[PDB]
């Protein structure tokens, strides 16, 4: 299943990075790279992922 | 809706999901919505029909691959067992959509087998931050001169 | 699958083991060092616990700096974990009260 | 939970006469840090709790309950077997020989 | 934990048994024992917990 990502990034555009600044509870600049083969966002309740 | 069902093509046909049997090809369930169901059994209906319809909207007619290929799932698998969430991930793979899963530290071992990076988010006081983590497989050989 | 979920990581125990290791060493220790000295069986979630402890204790994590670790599974599979650079210190983590 | 705990207390009494509270889909939206507080509050108010969960947060239930009801499906029929955590541990150890 | 468990069984009625007969997917007769110290109900999706 995982190796099927080879088509992703070649036939289509896929998100790869998110940048934030003074958004929500994220004071100042913040960043998070997003992997080609899928990714997860984890953190305790009330952490800011949503 | 009276004039819609006359002049609007979208209203000229009614839709309904159907579960087919792999061997015989017969119908087991006709499901115009998601009423009933257990939850997880309801969430899989929702995710399947949403992903299938999401590739409809993101694809020009006849194209196999949508030009925009990312999908975001909040509270991923919040009310589904592992065996069911596996099939949601499989469906997302079949249509060819890069997936970003959110989860409050649940089903971690599931994401472990179907993702290659995580974004740990944490809060202290009135501030929050993020950290990037990743992993890959050294497929060259599990253990040379050994079973694999 | 039921049994695999039944054998879940005991979150509380890992905190105690990490605190014991930090008391034994009494020095900055990176995530790779914690991985090598305390090889996890639920690698991904254990790293989440360590980063959570670091953030909770105010020990900020240099995301822009990278350090590596190597682990394995119960079926021979071997993985290479890319991690952020940070250093735990026992004093701050023992000042904090753990939930 | 606080409202129910009050409601089930007979007038002039501090403990509820009916003690059971069912939490269906117990912790689908919370981590350990919040589920533990839910459990603590639930026991503080004096209720005896029965939790439902589709194999999630198993490690947390193991520490605040003493018996599990394993319900599994086969075709159109469903069967339930009640066990203690330790008996299920022995079962897992037998599985461990595989 | 048991220091607090003394409340159960002493002051209040505790649900200690449920028995079913041709209820939902439970053909024939079934019964689940509820420990007086708190019970969990587990099982894969669509197995009859609800
Ligand atoms: N508009 C808002 N109203 C109330 N609280 C908010 C709001 N926006 C942010 N918050 C705070 O910021 C966080 C937003 O929710 P969040 O933590 O991102 O959800 P999740 O638990 O999925 O991570 C919460 O900690 C919340 O307390
Ligand atoms: N009265 C009913 N209406 C619709 N579906 C039902 C009904 N009774 C049983 N079902 C089926 O039996 C199960 C009932 O839901 P259930 O499994 O108890 O939810 P949960 O996953 O939380 O345990 C489901 O698998 C469902 O498909
Ligand atoms: F929604 Be049921 F409790 F799985």
């Amino acid at each position: 299943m995982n190796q099927v990502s080879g088509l992703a990034g070649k036939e289509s555009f896929i998100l790869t990075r998110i940048e934030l600044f003074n958004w929500g509870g994220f004071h100042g600049l913040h960043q998070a790279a997003i992997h080609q083969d899928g990714t997860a966002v984890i953190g305790p309740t009330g952490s800011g992922k949503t | 809706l009276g004039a819609k069902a006359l002049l609007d093509p979208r209203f000229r046909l009614e839709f309904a999901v159907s579960v087919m049997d792999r061997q015989s090809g017969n119908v087991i369930e006709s499901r115009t919505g998601s009423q009933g169901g257990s939850g997880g059994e309801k969430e899989i209906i929702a995710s399947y029909v949403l992903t299938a319809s999401l590739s409809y909207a993101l694809c020009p007619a006849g194209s196999r691959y949508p030009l925009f290929g990312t999908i975001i799932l909040d509270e991923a698998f919040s009310r589904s067992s592992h065996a069911v969430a596996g099939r949601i991930i499989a469906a997302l793979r079949e249509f060819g959509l890069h997936a970003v899963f959110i989860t409050p530290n649940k089903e971690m071992r599931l994401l472990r087998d179907h993702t290659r990076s995580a974004i740990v988010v944490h809060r202290r006081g009135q501030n929050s931050n993020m950290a990037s983590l990743s992993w890959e497989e050294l497929e060259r050989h599990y253990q040379r001169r050994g079973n694999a | 699958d039921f049994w695999d979920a039944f054998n879940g990581l005991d979150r509380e125990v890992l905190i105690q083991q990490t605190l014991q290791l930090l008391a034994k060493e009494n020095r900055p220790v990176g995530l790779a060092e914690l991985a090598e000295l305390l090889p996890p069986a639920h690698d991904l979630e254990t790293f989440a616990v360590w980063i959570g402890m670091a953030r909770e204790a105010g020990i900020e994590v240099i995301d822009s700096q990278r350090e590596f670790a190597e682990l394995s599974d119960g079926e021979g599979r071997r993985w290479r974990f890319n991690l952020p650079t940070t250093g735990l210190e026992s004093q701050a983590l023992m000042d904090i009260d753990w939930e």
Side-chain angles (χ1 to χ4, degrees), chain B residues 29 31 35-41 79:
Chain B
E29 297 175 35
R31 187 85 77 148
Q35 282 88 359
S38 39
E41 185 184 345
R79 52 167 49 97

Side-chain angles (χ1 to χ4, degrees), chain C residues 58-74:
Chain C
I59 305 180
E60 62 78 22
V61 177
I62 310 301
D63 179 309
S64 56
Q65 291 176 4
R66 295 259 81 83
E67 67 189 48
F68 292 85
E70 177 165 352
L71 299 57
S72 57
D73 286 344

Side-chain angles (χ1 to χ4, degrees), chain A residues 33 35 38-42, chain B residues 108 115-120 131-135, chain C residues 44:
Chain A
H35 202 289
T39 176
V41 189
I42 66 189
Chain B
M108 201 75 68
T115 72
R116 299 302 153 211
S117 86
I119 296 158
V120 177
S132 305
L133 181 141
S134 175
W135 60 92
Chain C
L44 172 55

Side-chain angles (χ1 to χ4, degrees), chain B residues 34 39-48 75-80 88:
Chain B
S34 202
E41 185 184 345
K42 192 181 287 182
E43 172 162 21
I44 199 167
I45 298 313
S47 161
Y48 262 51
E75 297 317 318
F77 331 124
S78 75
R79 52 167 49 97
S80 62
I88 293 175

Side-chain angles (χ1 to χ4, degrees), chain B:
Chain B
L1 84 89
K4 294 202 201 333
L6 176 69
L7 286 319
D8 216 322
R10 303 173 296 175
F11 287 72
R12 290 293 216 86
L13 73 182
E14 140 184 343
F15 304 97
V17 164
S18 293
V19 182
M20 286 321 197
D21 190 18
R22 176 68 72 177
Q23 305 297 350
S24 73
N26 289 293
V27 170
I28 308 90
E29 297 175 35
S30 179
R31 187 85 77 148
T32 192
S34 202
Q35 282 88 359
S38 39
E41 185 184 345
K42 192 181 287 182
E43 172 162 21
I44 199 167
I45 298 313
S47 161
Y48 262 51
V49 80
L50 271 162
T51 312
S53 69
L54 189 66
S55 86
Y56 180 109
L58 298 176
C59 274
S63 181
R64 200 260 169 262
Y65 298 98
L67 196 51
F68 184 104
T70 292
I71 181 179
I72 315 301
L73 282 92
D74 199 1
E75 297 317 318
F77 331 124
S78 75
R79 52 167 49 97
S80 62
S81 174
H82 170 91
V84 175
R87 300 208 293 272
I88 293 175
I89 300 187
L92 258 59
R93 206 89 63 174
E94 271 297 340
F95 298 96
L97 302 179
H98 161 270
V100 179
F101 304 115
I102 317 298
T103 183
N105 292 358
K106 291 185 186 295
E107 299 297 336
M108 201 75 68
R109 181 177 135 286
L110 166 41
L111 299 167
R112 174 55 174 78
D113 290 342
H114 297 84
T115 72
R116 299 302 153 211
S117 86
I119 296 158
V120 177
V121 186
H122 199 82
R123 146 186 293 276
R124 183 161 90 160
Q126 204 165 37
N127 315 123
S128 55
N129 59 67
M130 321 185 317
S132 305
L133 181 141
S134 175
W135 60 92
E136 64 169 306
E137 186 178 19
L138 303 181
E139 180 53 281
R140 289 295 87 190
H141 69 84
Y142 286 177
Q143 44 205 348
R144 190 67 176 171
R145 296 168 57 194
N147 190 270

Side-chain angles (χ1 to χ4, degrees), chain A:
Chain A
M1 268 199 267
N2 293 295
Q3 294 201 0
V4 171
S5 181
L7 286 303
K10 179 164 70 80
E11 309 297 329
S12 65
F13 286 93
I14 57 177
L15 175 64
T16 59
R17 176 175 271 265
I18 298 169
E19 314 280 287
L20 302 176
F21 185 87
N22 280 344
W23 175 269
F26 294 107
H27 294 63
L29 179 159
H30 288 275
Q31 306 179 331
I34 273 154
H35 202 289
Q36 178 189 252
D37 308 345
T39 176
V41 189
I42 66 189
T45 298
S47 162
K49 50 200 177 286
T50 202

